[PDB]
Amino acid sequence: GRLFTSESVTEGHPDKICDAISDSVLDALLAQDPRSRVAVETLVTTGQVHVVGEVTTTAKEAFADITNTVRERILDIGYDSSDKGFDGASCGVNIGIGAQSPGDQGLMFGYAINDTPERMPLPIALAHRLSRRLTEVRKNGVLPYLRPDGKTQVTIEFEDDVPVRLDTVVISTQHAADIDLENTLTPDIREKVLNTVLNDLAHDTLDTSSTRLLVNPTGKFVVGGPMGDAGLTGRKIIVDTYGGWARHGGGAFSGKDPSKVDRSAAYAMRWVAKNIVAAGLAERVEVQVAYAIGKAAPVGLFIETFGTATVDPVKIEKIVPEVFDLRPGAIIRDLDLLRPIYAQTAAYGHFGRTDVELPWEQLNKVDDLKRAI
Amino acid sequence: SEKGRLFTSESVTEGHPDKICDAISDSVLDALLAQDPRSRVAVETLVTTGQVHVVGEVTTTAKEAFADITNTVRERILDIGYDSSDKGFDGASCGVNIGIGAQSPGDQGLMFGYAINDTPERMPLPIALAHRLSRRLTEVRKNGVLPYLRPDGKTQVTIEFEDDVPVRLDTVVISTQHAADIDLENTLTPDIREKVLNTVLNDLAHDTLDTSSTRLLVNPTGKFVVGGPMGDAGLTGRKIIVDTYGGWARHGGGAFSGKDPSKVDRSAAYAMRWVAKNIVAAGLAERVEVQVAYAIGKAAPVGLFIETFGTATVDPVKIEKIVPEVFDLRPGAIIRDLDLLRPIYAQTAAYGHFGRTDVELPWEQLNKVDDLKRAI
Ligand SMILES: [Ca+2]
Ligand SMILES: [Ca+2]
Ligand SMILES: [Ca+2]
Ligand SMILES: [Ca+2]
C-alpha cells in the first residue's frame, strides 16, 4: 500500500508571514492602481522585517503607507507581543523597494482529481483543511490559548489508487505557556480541529478508525514566528500548490502582479484541470501549457489522464484551447485578475480553497466543455 | 494520434540574483563545516540593489569562521564576477548586513528522486541541456574566450518528444549580461552560437535530438549591461526546480542551500537521486521516480515506492524490495555513507545539484550498481 504525505502551515509560519506581507503590498497597490507592476520579496527574522524589490505604480499614497500595511498584516496574523515571539506594532520594519512611475518560452502545469469536493489531492486537501481549522479555532475563541505559528502533516495509505486509510496526522501549534500538552492541547486539537475537519469532509473510503494523531510531538511551542528562525517569500511553493502530488514548473506566486505568467498561467491551468474533472471527462488530470516567444496563444496544450479519461484524451487536448482563451491578456481579463484579491491566497493554499471563492476555482466552464464533446 | 509533446526547462548562471543568494548561503555553510563538521546551519540570504542581508541561525564551535562571514560573503560575490558598479554590483563595496543568531552546542516525510537514460548524466534532457548551456556560458566568460560577458544569465531549452523519444530541439534561449560596447546581432549572437550552443551540442552528441532547425534566440529582449541584484531582488531557495529536475519530476518541497546535512530536505533528496540513478544505471528501468516515506519515531523508512512508467526490466515490486536491503536510508547512515559532513556545498549552489558533468558529487556515484545486480 502506497503512502503519501503532504503538509500545510498556518499564516503564522515565518515563510507564510513573508508570503502574506508580499501579497498585502501587492493588494494595497492594486487597490489604487490596478495596472501596477510588482515584484516584492519579504524577509523576516528575530524582531525584524525587510521588504525589498521593485514596483511601477501610480499608487504613491499606498506606497508611502507600506510600512503600516506591513505592521497591520502582522497584527492580523496575531503577532502582538514579544511574549509570542513577535509584535507587529513594535518590530523592526525596513523598506528597500525601488519605485518608479509608468512573451517567453514557458511551461506551466495544473492539476485536479476527484478525491475531494474541492477536486484536490487528498493529502494536501486535508492538510490545508486542518491548518485553516487550526487558525479558525484560535481566532474565533474556541481555543483562545493558541498562538499563530503552526503546521499540519497528513499521511494517507492508498490501495489501487483509492485512498483507504488515514495513517498519520501531525498537528504542531504554538500556544500559551500554562497549557498542559497531554490533557488540554491534545484532546482539544483532536476534538475541535481533527474531528471537525473529518466530519466536514465525510470521505467515502478514507478509514480514520486507527489514525495515529500526534499533537506537538517535539513538545512545548510557546514562542514562534520569526523568533529564532527566518522566513522568506516564495519558500512554500509546494504547500501553495498540490503538496508534492503534481509536477511544478517552478516559480513562486506571492509578491507578483498578474502580468507574471508564473502566477497567472498557473492559476489558469488549475482552472482548466478542475473544470475537466468536474465535467467528468477524467477523474484526475495534469494539464501542461507550452508558450513560445513571439506568440500570445499557447503553441501547445497537453494532458495526462493516467488511464482515467472517459473520452479520448486527444479530444480533450483539442477542445481545451477552443473552450479556454489561454492568451495571457485573456486570462487576466476573464478571471478578473487586476483586483486586490491576493493577500487571501498567501496562506492555506492557492488551490482548492473551501473558505474563499477564487476565480480559478470556478466551475463555469463545465457546461462549455460538455457542449464541445 | 497526439501532437508531439513539448517540454521546456531553464537554468541560470551563478550571477542570477537568486543564485547569488544560494551561493552565499552555501558558502557560509562550507566555511562553518570546514572548522566544525557538525555545525547546525539554517542560513538565508537576500540581495537587492547594492546590498546583501544574511540571516538565520547557527549552532557551531567555528567562532573564527563565524566572525569572518562578512568577508566570505564579499569574496563569493567577487568570485561570481561582480566587482564594479558598472556591472550592477560590487562585492568589495556593497552593503553587507549579518543578522544571524549564534550559539554553541524524526518527521513524517516524503522525498522524491529521479533518473532517466535520455542523457549520459541520466537526467531529463531539457534540464540537462539547460544546465550544460548555463555552465558553458559561465565557462567562456571566466576562461577569456568571450571576455566581454558579465555574470548574470539564463538559459531555456524546449524539446519536442514523439512517443517519449526526444526528436527535436525546438528552441534555445540564451540571455546573458555583457559589456556596453557589444554588437548584439554581429558579435554576441554568433559568438554564443559558436562557443556555447555548438560546443554543448557536440559534447552531448545526442543520438536522436535533431538540432538542424533549432530556433536560437540570444538576448531576445535586447541589451543586458547591468544585472545581478541591480533593479531586482534575490533570495535563497527560489530556484528549487532549477536545482533539481527542471519540472520533469515531482518535488516534495524544500530548498537545499543554507542547510546543513542534518536537514532531511537536503540529504534525503540527495539520497533519492543516488538511488534512482543507480537503479537506471543497473539496467532495472529506463526511467524511475523513487519515493521514500519516513515516519516520526523511526529512523529507517516505513516505505519505499517506485514508478518506472512502463520501462522496468524486472518486477517493480522486486525493485522496491531490494532498495532498502541495498541502501541504508536512515538519515545518519546517508550522512556517513555519502560523507556529507564536509565543505562540499558551495559548488552545488548553481548549475543544478543533480546530473553535474563538471564536478563529482557523492549522490551521483554509480557505486551501488553492482550491489543492485547481486540483489536481483
Ligand atoms: Ca459521500
Ligand atoms: Ca459556462
Ligand atoms: Ca558497490
Ligand atoms: Ca544474488
Instruction: Quote the minimal CA–CA distance from A3 to chain B in Å.
Output: 7
B205: how many CB neighbours lie within 10 A of its CB? 8
| Nearest by Cα to B226 from B179, B184, B187 | B179
> What residues does the ion ligand 3 have nearby, CB within 5 Å?
B 367, 370-371
Give the SS3 label for residue A149.
Answer: strand
How far apart are the C-alpha atoms of A268 and A278, rounded to whole Å?
15
B280: how many CB neighbours lie within 10 A of its CB? 21
The secondary structure of residue A117, as a DSSP letter, is: T
Grid cell locating B208: 536522436
**CA A206 to ligand 1 center in whole angstroms:** 11
Question: Quick check: is B57 catalytic?
Answer: yes
A276: how many CB neighbours lie within 10 A of its CB? 28
Q: Which residues pair with A87 in a beta bridge?
A: A80
How far apart are the C-alpha atoms of B200 and B125, rounded to whole Å?
13
| Nearest by Cα to B8 from B169, B238, B208, B182 | B169
Query: Angle between the A66-77 and A14-32 helix axes, to the nearest 10 degrees?
Result: 130
How was this entry determined? X-ray
In chain B, residues with a C-beta closer than 8 Å to the C-beta of A299 are 6
Q: Whose grid coordinates read 515565518?
A: A14
Task: Check if the beta carbon of residue A215 is closer than 8 Å to that of residue A185.
Answer: yes
In chain A, residues with a C-beta closer than 8 Å to the C-beta of B158 are 105, 290, 292
Q: What are the C-alpha distances in Å from B97 to residues B52, B70, B328? A: 6, 8, 41
**CA B325 to ligand 4 center in whole angstroms:** 12
What is the H or E stretch that residue A80 is in?
A: strand A80-81
Residue-range domain boundaries for chain B? 1-11+125-226, 12-105+227-263, 106-124+264-376
> B176 phi and psi, to 5 degrees?
-140, 140
Contact (CB<8Å) A2/B303: yes
Interstrand relation of A230-232 and B89-90 (parallel, antiparallel or unpaired): unpaired
Instruction: Quote the minimal CA–CA distance from A19 to chain B in Å.
Output: 13
Closest-approaching ligand to the CA atom of A205:
1
The secondary structure of residue A49, as a DSSP letter, is: E
**CA B376 to ligand 4 center in whole angstroms:** 6
Residue A228 CB-half CA count within 13 A? 10
Question: Quick check: is B233 catalytic?
Answer: yes
How far apart are the C-alpha atoms of A220 and A231, rounded to whole Å?
21
CATH number belonging to domain B12-105+227-263: 3.30.300.10
Task: Check if the beta carbon of residue A156 is closer than 8 Å to that of residue A123.
Answer: yes
| Nearest by Cα to A371 from A302, A273, A275 | A275
How far apart are the C-alpha atoms of A245 and A76, rounded to whole Å?
31
Q: What are the C-alpha distances in Å from B355 to residues B125, B166, B167, B361? A: 10, 18, 21, 9
Same fold yes or no, B12-105+227-263 and B106-124+264-376: yes
**CA B328 to ligand 3 center in whole angstroms:** 13
How far apart are the C-alpha atoms of A311 and A320, rounded to whole Å?
13
| Nearest by Cα to B246 from B74, B7, B5, B29 | B7
How far apart are the C-alpha atoms of B118 and B113, rounded to whole Å?
16
Contact (CB<8Å) B53/A43: yes
Residues 6+ apart with CB under 8 A from A292: A103, A105, A299, B158, B171
| Nearest by Cα to B351 from B197, B153, B173 | B153
How far apart are the C-alpha atoms of B126 and A105, rounded to whole Å?
13
Interstrand relation of A106-113 and A80-81 (parallel, antiparallel or unpaired): unpaired
Instruction: Quote the minimal CA–CA distance from B17 to chain A in Å.
Output: 12
Q: Which residues of A are annotated as a binding site?
A: 13, 15, 41, 54, 100, 149-151, 220-221, 229, 235-236, 252, 256, 260
How far apart are the C-alpha atoms of B26 and B29, rounded to whole Å?
5
Residues 6+ apart with CB under 8 A from B94: B50, B51, B52, B74, B77
Question: Quick check: is B238 catalytic?
Answer: yes
Q: Which CATH number fits domain B1-11+125-226: 3.30.300.10, 3.40.50.720, 3.90.870.10, 3.40.640.10?
A: 3.30.300.10
Residues 6+ apart with CB under 8 A from B331: B106, B262, B264, B267, B268, B299
Which entry of B259, B273, B287, B353 is annotated as an active-site residue? B259
Longest dimension (CA), chain B: 65
Closest-approaching ligand to the CA atom of A323:
2
Grid cell locating A234: 516564495
Q: Which residues pair with A148 in a beta bridge?
A: none
How far apart are the C-alpha atoms of A338 and B62, rounded to whole Å?
50
Architecture of the domain defined by A103-121+261-373: 2-Layer Sandwich (3.30)
Question: Quick check: is B14 catalytic?
Answer: no
Grid cell locating B301: 523508512
Grid cell locating A60: 504613491
* Alpha carbon of residue B265 to chain centroid: 14
CATH number belonging to domain A9-102+224-260: 3.30.300.10
Q: Does domain A1-8+122-223 have CATH number 3.30.1180.20?
A: no
| Nearest by Cα to A352 from A156, A131, A157 | A131
Q: What are the C-alpha distances in Å from B164 to residues A109, B121, B255? A: 18, 18, 29
* Cα-Cα end-to-end distance for chain A: 36
Interstrand relation of A212-215 and A162-175 (parallel, antiparallel or unpaired): parallel
Q: Which residues of A are annotated as a binding site for L-methionine?
A: 54, 100, 229, 260
Grid cell locating B178: 555583457
Grid cell locating A283: 477523474
The string of DSSP codes covering A207-242 is B-TT-EEEESTT----S-TTTTSEEETTS-HHHHTT
Closest-approaching ligand to the CA atom of A202:
1
CA angle, B192 then B218 then B144, to 5°: 30
Contact (CB<8Å) B110/A214: no
Resolution of the solved structure (Å) = 1.7
Active site positions of A, annotated: 13, 15-16, 41, 54, 151, 221, 229-230, 235-236, 256, 260, 262
How far apart are the C-alpha atoms of B48 and B77, rounded to whole Å?
13
Query: Which of B99, B156, B305 is the closest to A105 by Cβ?
Result: B156
Q: Whose grid coordinates read 500559551?
A: A176
Q: Whose grid coordinates read 544585472?
A: B227
Q: Please give the radius of gyration of chain B, using alpha carbons only, rounded to the nearest integer.
A: 21
Instruction: Quote the minimal CA–CA distance from A48 to chain B in Å.
Output: 10
How far apart are the C-alpha atoms of B32 and B29, rounded to whole Å?
5
Reading phi first (left if > 0) and then psi (alpha if -120 to 50, else beta), residue B274 is in alpha
B336: how many CB neighbours lie within 10 A of its CB? 12
Query: Which of B1, B56, B242 is the closest to A230 by Cβ?
Result: B56
Among B1, B3, B7, B8, which would you mutate to test the A interface (most chain A Cβ atoms within 10 Å of its Cβ)? B8
How far apart are the C-alpha atoms of B253 and B255, rounded to whole Å?
7
A194: how many CB neighbours lie within 10 A of its CB? 22
Q: Which CATH number fits domain B106-124+264-376: 3.90.79.10, 3.30.70.250, 3.30.300.10, 3.40.50.1010?
A: 3.30.300.10
The secondary structure of residue A70, as a DSSP letter, is: H
Side chain identity, residue A135: T
Grid cell locating B253: 518541497
| Nearest by Cα to B101 from A48, A20, A175 | A48
Residues 6+ apart with CB under 8 A from A127: A6, A7, A8, A152, A153, A154, A243
* Alpha carbon of residue A91 to chain centroid: 26
| Sign of the dihedral defined by the CA atoms of residues B370, B372, B375, B376, in that order | negative
Q: Which residues pair with B51 in a beta bridge?
A: B48, B95
Interstrand relation of A146-159 and A162-175 (parallel, antiparallel or unpaired): antiparallel
| Nearest by Cα to A304 from B123, B2, B285, B159 | B2
| Sign of the dihedral defined by the CA atoms of residues A159, A164, A168, A172, in that order | positive
> B52 phi and psi, to 5 degrees?
-120, 135
Buried b or exposed e, range B31-55, using 16+ CB within 10 angstroms: bbbebbeebbbbbbbbbbbebbbbb
How far apart are the C-alpha atoms of B261 and B305, rounded to whole Å?
23
Give the SS3 label for residue A154.
Answer: strand
Q: Which residues pair with A17 in a beta bridge?
A: none
Task: Check if the beta carbon of residue A320 is closer than 8 Å to that of residue A370.
Answer: no
Segments in chain A forming alpha helices (H): 14-32, 60-64, 66-77, 122-139, 186-189, 195-201, 237-240, 261-278, 313-323, 328-334, 366-372
Burial grade of A362 (CB within 10 A; 0-12, 13-18, 19 or more):
middle
Contact (CB<8Å) B99/A46: yes
Instruction: Quote the minimal CA–CA distance from B306 to chain A in Å.
Output: 10
> B90 phi and psi, to 5 degrees?
-135, 110
* Alpha carbon of residue B320 to chain centroid: 27
Contact (CB<8Å) B46/A54: no
> B273 phi and psi, to 5 degrees?
-60, -45
* Cα-Cα end-to-end distance for chain B: 38
The string of DSSP codes covering A162-222 is EEEEEEEEEEEEEE-TT--IIIIIHHHHIIIIIHHHHHHH--SS-B-TT-EEEESTT----
In chain A, residues with a C-beta closer than 8 Å to the C-beta of B46 are 41, 43, 50, 52, 232
How far apart are the C-alpha atoms of B50 and B87, rounded to whole Å?
11
HEC assignment per residue over chain B = CCCCEEEEEEEECCCCHHHHHHHHHHHHHHHHHHHCCCCEEEEEEEEECCEEEEEEEEECCCHHHHHCHHHHHHHHHHHHCCEEHHHCEECCCCEEEEEEEEECCCCCEEEEEEEECCCCCCCCHHHHHHHHHHHHHHHHHHCCCCCCEEEEEEEEEEEEEECCEEEEEEEEEEEEEECCCCCHHHHHHHHHHHHHHHHHHHHHCCCCCECCCCEEEECCCCCCCCCCCCCCEEECCCCCCCCCCCCCCCCCCCCCCCECCCCHHHHHHHHHHHHHHHHHHCCCCCEEEEEEEECCCCCCCCEEEEECCCCCCCCHHHHHHHHHHHCCCCHHHHHHHCCCCCCCCHHHHCCCCCCCCCCCCHHHCCCCHHHHHHHC
Give the SS3 label for residue A320.
Answer: helix
How far apart are the C-alpha atoms of A348 and A20, rounded to whole Å?
11
